[PDB]
Amino acid sequence: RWILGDKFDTVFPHKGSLKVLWESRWKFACSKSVYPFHDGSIEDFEPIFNHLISKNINDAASDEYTQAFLPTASALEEKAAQALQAGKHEEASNLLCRAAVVYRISRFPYVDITKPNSIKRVAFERQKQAYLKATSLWTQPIREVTVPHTYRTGNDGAHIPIYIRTPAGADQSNPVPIVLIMTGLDGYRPDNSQRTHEILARGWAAVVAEIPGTADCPADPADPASPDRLWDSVLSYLDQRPELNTAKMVVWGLSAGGYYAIRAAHTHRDRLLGAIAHGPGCHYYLDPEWLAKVNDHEYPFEITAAWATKHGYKTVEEFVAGAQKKFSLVETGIVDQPSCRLLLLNGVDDGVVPIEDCLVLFEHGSPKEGRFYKGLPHMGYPNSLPVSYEWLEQVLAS
C-alpha cells in the first residue's frame, strides 16, 4: 500500500533494544558526530551506553535512562569552568557544547510539555543554560530573545523564546537575509549549531523557534490554527529588527518542523521568499494504517506516545482516531491555496513519515520543488544537507 513497500512490514532490529540501537546505528552516528550526536564526542557517550546496556535499560522515556547521562554532563560543566578559569575560552565553549549534547540525548526523544517536574524537562533546562554559556564565547554569539506573543488567543502562552545569530557586520544600513529554523519532536533551539554556522557563512541571520506541542513553544498544541498565530508574533518581531531583512526570508522545517514549514509556505506566503520541509509529514503520517506500524521503523524509540502529546491529545487512542481529520494540511484544505517556493527533501524509504506526504503536495496549489533519495530512511541524511544550502543560495540570491 506504501512506496516504502515490504520494508513497511519489517520489524526493525533496534525496536525495544537500546543495545542494538547503540551497536548498529547510534555508536557510529556518535563516532561521526552527526545527528543526533552533532557537536558531541564518543568519549562522553561510550561509558553511558555501556552502563545502560549492562543494566538492560531500553525505555528512553524512563528516569533510569535520563539519569545515566547527568553526572557526565556535570563533569563536562566543571571541566569547562576550569578551562574558563585558565582563560581557555575555545576549550570551555567546546566542553559546554559536549555537555549540551549529553543533555540532548538524555531527553531523547521528547520532553513531555504536560510534565514540568520530569527529569527530561530538568535535562532540557540544563542543556539551554550550558548551550547559551558555550555560544556566548562565540565571535557571533547565539542570543535568546523572549518574543511577546501579541497574537496569542485561547490557551496560547504569553512568551516565545527564540535563538537569533547575526553574521559579522549585520547592520540597519544593509539588513541581512533571514533563515528561520522550525525545530521538531526531539530537536529544539539548542540543537542547530552547524546550521547557524552555514547560514552565517553565507552572510545570513539564523533564527530558531520550536513548534507547537514541544519544548518552550506557547502555541496551543490542540488548536490547528495556533502555529498561524505563533508565526504572526515571530515574523512581526523580525519585521521590527533593523538589521534583519524580512523581504529576504526563508523558513526551514526539520522533521516534525517540516509540517510547520509546509503550513507557513501557504499561510504566510506573502511574507516568505521560500520554505524547506526536511523529512515532513502533512497528511498520510496520521493515517491509522501508517500509525499502526510507525513504531516498528527507523525512529530510535516508540514515537506515537510523544506524537499524541505534541498534537495535544490526552491519550494515544484519541490521537490515532482523530488526528488526521483535525491536523492534515490536505483534509483541512491548507494545501488548496498558493504557496511561496517550497523545497521538499526526504529519503524515499522513510518509515517515520511516508514519502507520499511529499508526493501529495504536487497535486495541490502552486508547483512544489523536491529531491527524494532512493533507498534512504527519514531525512535522507547525509545526502539531503548540501542541496539545502545550494537552494537557499539560489532563493536568497542578490
Residue numbers in the entry: 3 to 400
What wording appears in the published article?
A common step during their assembly is polyketide trimming, which Afyg1p, Wdyg1p, and PlAntI catalyze. In summary, the N‐ and C‐domains in all three enzymes are oriented in a back‐to‐back fashion forming an interface that encloses the intramolecular binding cavity next to the active site. The resulting Ser‐His‐Asp network is perfectly aligned with distances in the range of 2.5–2.8 Å between the active‐site residues.
For example, in Aspergillus fumigatus (Af), the type I PKS AfPksP produces the naphthopyrone heptaketide YWA1, whose acetoacetyl side chain is removed by the serine hydrolase Afyg1p. Single‐wavelength anomalous diffraction (SAD) was performed to obtain experimental phases for Afyg1p, which was used as a model for Patterson search calculations of the Wdyg1p structure. The amino acid sequences of Afyg1p and Wdyg1p have 40% sequence identity, which explains the similarity in their overall folds and active‐site residues (rmsd = 1.1 Å over 382 Cα‐atoms, Figure 3b). Although both enzymes differ significantly from PlAntI in terms of catalysis and primary sequence, their superposition shows a perfect match of secondary structure elements (rmsd = 1.6 Å over 244 Cα‐atoms for Afyg1p and rmsd = 1.8 Å over 247 Cα‐atoms for Wdyg1p). Thereby, Trp309 is located adjacent to the oxyanion hole and coordinates a well‐defined water molecule that is also present in Afyg1papo, Afyg1pPMSF, and Afyg1p:1,3‐DHN, as well as in Afyg1p:THN. Taken together, the specificity pocket of Afyg1p is entirely occupied by the product, whereas in Afyg1papo, each position matching the hydroxyl groups 1─OH, 6─OH, and 8─OH of THN and 1─OH of 1,3‐DHN (analogous to 3─OH in THN) is filled by a water molecule.
